Write a protein that binds this ligand. Structure first.
Ligand SMILES: [Mg+2]
Lengths: 94, 97
DNA sequence: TAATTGCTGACTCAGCAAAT
DNA sequence: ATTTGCTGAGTCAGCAATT
């Protein structure tokens, strides 16, 4: 209360609450519920920020992948053109 | 009742004019109500904008994934055209020209 | 030498479903 | 099942920029 109450367990809890005032059995469970909800919000906020960075990282790595392929296209264009000229210049061999 | 929509569009100068003569613990209550209503809208913008930034990022990823596919196609296209023009050249070299 | 605006991390609650 | 976990909407506090 409030730190051994969230960390405490489903049975262990009911062991510590066996003869408890039946209106304070409800109050303590309400209290713990609320404290956990606070921790869920903390995860939810956290998960959101992690997904956001993950999405932006994916965007970055697609951008640099495009860049790689841009470099290859230009190499291959040149290599093809080296042969196309070579090919055409032989064909005028006459 | 007292429609919120109007209370938030008002100026704090215009509001004071309205409670020209007015109770104290209700004046303080009413200005704080106004703020709460504004904070509600501020929260919505925050929420709405970030889902929209998420969707925009998701589209951007989609647009880029496409360009990669197109580039990959072009890559194998050029490599094959290189090969074809090379094979044609070596054959022409064989005949001797 | 005030008070208001807009933003945002954090909390609380409702309701929804799955794991326990 | 109960409790758990998650998430959108609201509320508040407190910060800086604005008037
Ligand atoms: Mg029941």
């Amino acid at each position: 209360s409030d730190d051994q109450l969230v960390s405490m367990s489903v049975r262990e809890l009911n062991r510590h609450l066996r003869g408890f005032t039946k209106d304070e059995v409800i109050r303590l469970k309400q209290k713990r519920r609320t404290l956990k909800n606070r921790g869920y919000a903390q995860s939810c906020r956290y998960k959101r920020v992690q997904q956001k960075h993950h999405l932006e990282n994916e965007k970055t790595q697609l951008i640099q992948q495009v860049e790689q392929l841009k470099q290859e296209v230009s190499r291959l264009a040149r290599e093809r053109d080296a042969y196309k000229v070579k090919s055409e210049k032989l064909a005028n061999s006459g």
